[PDB]
Design an enzyme around this catalytic site. Structure first.
Site, PDB file in Angstrom:
ATOM      1  N   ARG A  35      17.069   2.328  -3.819  1.00  9.22           N
ATOM      2  CA  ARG A  35      15.611   2.248  -3.462  1.00  9.22           C
ATOM      3  C   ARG A  35      15.324   2.280  -2.433  1.00  9.22           C
ATOM      4  NH1 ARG A  35      14.994  -1.794  -6.490  1.00  9.22           N
ATOM      5  NH2 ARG A  35      13.737  -3.403  -5.711  1.00  9.22           N
TER       6      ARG A  35
ATOM      7  N   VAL B 148       2.843   4.245   1.432  1.00  4.38           N
ATOM      8  CA  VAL B 148       3.420   5.185   2.820  1.00  4.38           C
ATOM      9  C   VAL B 148       3.317   6.534   2.820  1.00  4.38           C
ATOM     10  CG1 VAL B 148       5.786   5.259   4.192  1.00  4.38           C
ATOM     11  CG2 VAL B 148       5.238   3.201   2.262  1.00  4.38           C
TER      12      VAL B 148
ATOM     13  N   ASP C 201      16.076  -8.498  -0.731  1.00  2.24           N
ATOM     14  CA  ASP C 201      16.182  -7.240  -1.413  1.00  2.24           C
ATOM     15  C   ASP C 201      16.645  -5.457  -1.065  1.00  2.24           C
ATOM     16  OD1 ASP C 201      14.261  -5.943  -3.250  1.00  2.24           O
ATOM     17  OD2 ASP C 201      12.660  -5.449  -2.149  1.00  2.24           O
TER      18      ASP C 201
ATOM     19  N   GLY D  98       0.504  -1.076   0.099  1.00  2.00           N
ATOM     20  CA  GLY D  98       0.393  -0.416   0.072  1.00  2.00           C
ATOM     21  C   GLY D  98       0.815   0.823   0.065  1.00  2.00           C
TER      22      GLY D  98
HETATM   23  C1  LIG Z   1      12.623   1.033   1.468  1.00  2.00           C
HETATM   24  S1  LIG Z   1      11.004   1.854   2.676  1.00  2.00           S
HETATM   25  O1  LIG Z   1      10.921   0.070   2.593  1.00  2.00           O
HETATM   26  O2  LIG Z   1      11.508   2.917   3.514  1.00  2.00           O
HETATM   27  N1  LIG Z   1      10.098   2.602   1.409  1.00  2.00           N
HETATM   28  C2  LIG Z   1       9.008   1.743   0.651  1.00  2.00           C
HETATM   29  C3  LIG Z   1       7.924   2.220  -0.161  1.00  2.00           C
HETATM   30  O3  LIG Z   1       8.700   3.415  -0.499  1.00  2.00           O
HETATM   31  C4  LIG Z   1       8.654   4.210   0.598  1.00  2.00           C
HETATM   32  C5  LIG Z   1       9.343   5.868   0.187  1.00  2.00           C
HETATM   33  C6  LIG Z   1       9.709   6.043  -1.542  1.00  2.00           C
HETATM   34  S2  LIG Z   1      10.287   8.156  -0.940  1.00  2.00           S
HETATM   35  C7  LIG Z   1      10.082   7.924   0.844  1.00  2.00           C
HETATM   36  C8  LIG Z   1       9.547   9.000   1.182  1.00  2.00           C
HETATM   37  C9  LIG Z   1      10.220  10.117   0.540  1.00  2.00           C
HETATM   38  C10 LIG Z   1      10.557  11.754   1.311  1.00  2.00           C
HETATM   39  N2  LIG Z   1      10.265  12.593   0.148  1.00  2.00           N
HETATM   40  C11 LIG Z   1       9.073  13.319   0.071  1.00  2.00           C
HETATM   41  C12 LIG Z   1       9.863  13.963  -1.208  1.00  2.00           C
HETATM   42  O4  LIG Z   1      11.060  15.285  -1.157  1.00  2.00           O
HETATM   43  C13 LIG Z   1      11.999  14.474  -0.397  1.00  2.00           C
HETATM   44  C14 LIG Z   1      11.546  13.581   0.968  1.00  2.00           C
HETATM   45  C15 LIG Z   1      10.268  11.738   2.591  1.00  2.00           C
HETATM   46  C16 LIG Z   1      10.482  10.431   3.426  1.00  2.00           C
HETATM   47  C17 LIG Z   1      10.193   9.053   2.897  1.00  2.00           C
HETATM   48  N3  LIG Z   1       9.305   7.656   3.102  1.00  2.00           N
HETATM   49  C18 LIG Z   1       9.937   7.957   4.778  1.00  2.00           C
HETATM   50  O5  LIG Z   1      10.406   8.484   5.332  1.00  2.00           O
HETATM   51  C19 LIG Z   1      10.470   6.696   5.466  1.00  2.00           C
HETATM   52  N4  LIG Z   1      10.681   6.031   6.475  1.00  2.00           N
HETATM   53  C20 LIG Z   1       9.889   4.753   6.452  1.00  2.00           C
HETATM   54  C21 LIG Z   1       9.327   4.302   5.334  1.00  2.00           C
HETATM   55  N5  LIG Z   1       8.874   5.502   4.328  1.00  2.00           N
HETATM   56  N6  LIG Z   1       9.177   6.832   0.726  1.00  2.00           N
HETATM   57  C22 LIG Z   1      10.499   3.868   1.327  1.00  2.00           C
END
Ligand SMILES: CS(=O)(=O)N1CCO[C@H](c2csc(-c3cc(N4CCOCC4)ccc3NC(=O)c3ncc[nH]3)n2)C1
Length: 240
Positions: free
Chosen positions: A130, A25, A126, A23
């Site tokens: 990314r 995030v 994995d 789903g």
């Molecule tokens: C590898 S994962 O399992 O962690 N995963 C899988 C699904 O896609 C997620 C994702 C992609 S881009 C992103 C994200 C993007 C920003 N940005 C928004 C746009 O400007 C820059 C910061 C700020 C915070 C973000 N995420 C988090 O803090 C966060 N912590 C824990 C899981 N996710 N999250 C990450």
């Protein structure tokens, strides 16, 4: 087994940050026990994570289950995934030109993260740029517990994790190139069977390429461990 659960009313959800496997995030606000509120990321729609405490490995803040008519809470990574951060570094908005030492630090961070998980005999399965996230202090941590990151023999052990780490090293060195340009996914197994590997990036040191190349040896047992890799990257970094 609800030793890690949080009361749903302490959580306030907001806008979308990205899309995970099961789903969306979302960004969120978690009311903490000390009264204050913390920015969080919330995967929607974990047992492994509970057992982990290490700076370069994402930690579990808690779990919530809202009833309509579950959500895993993680720390907010303000620069997002590493792959996308590398892509932006080649344009002109957020980050400046990232020098070689900063790229090595990302590699060292990931190596430390993997060294820790490798000692727990935990297999990532994995590993890619990314799936590596960026903390507010510019440190990298491994997260999320894809044909071109999988090793030969796997077509999974701790040495197939090492293979994927080498691919991630390449991603960082190329600042976000897709592995194997002019090669299709179905074509990979035969491409690797004949002994071809990811080519050496442009202004990239032979010492560094030696390290990432060692991750892709045909025999898993010939590959180095994450601790061997970590020391090699740390000492290479120190010699600049
Ligand atoms: C590898 S994962 O399992 O962690 N995963 C899988 C699904 O896609 C997620 C994702 C992609 S881009 C992103 C994200 C993007 C920003 N940005 C928004 C746009 O400007 C820059 C910061 C700020 C915070 C973000 N995420 C988090 O803090 C966060 N912590 C824990 C899981 N996710 N999250 C990450």
């Amino acid at each position: 087994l609800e030793d890690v659960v949080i009361d749903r009313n302490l959580l306030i959800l907001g806008k979308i940050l990205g899309e995970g496997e099961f789903g969306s995030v979302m960004e969120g606000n978690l009311k903490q026990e000390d009264g204050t509120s913390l920015k969080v990321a919330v995967k929607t729609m974990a047992a492994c994570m509970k057992d982990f405490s290490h700076p370069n490995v994402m930690r579990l803040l808690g779990v919530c289950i809202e009833m309509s008519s579950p959500m895993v809470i993680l720390p907010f990574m303000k620069y997002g995934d590493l792959h996308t951060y590398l892509l932006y570094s080649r344009l002109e908005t957020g980050p400046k030109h990232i020098p070689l030492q900063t790229l090595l630090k990302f590699m060292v961070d990931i190596a430390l993260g993997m060294e820790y998980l490798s000692n727990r005999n935990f297999l990532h399965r994995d590993l890619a740029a990314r799936n590596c996230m960026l903390r507010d202090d510019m440190t990298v941590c491994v997260a999320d517990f894809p044909v071109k990151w999988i090793a030969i023999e796997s077509l999974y052990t701790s040495k197939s994790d090492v293979w994927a780490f080498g691919v991630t090293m390449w991603e960082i060195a190329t600042r976000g190139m897709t592995p194997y340009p002019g090669v299709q996914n179905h074509e990979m197994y035969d491409y690797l069977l004949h002994g071809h590997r990811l080519k050496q990036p442009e202004d990239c040191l032979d010492e560094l390429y030696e390290i990432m190349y060692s991750c892709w040896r045909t025999d898993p047992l010939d590959r180095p461990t994450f601790s061997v890799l970590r020391l090699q990257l740390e000492k290479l970094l120190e010699s600049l």
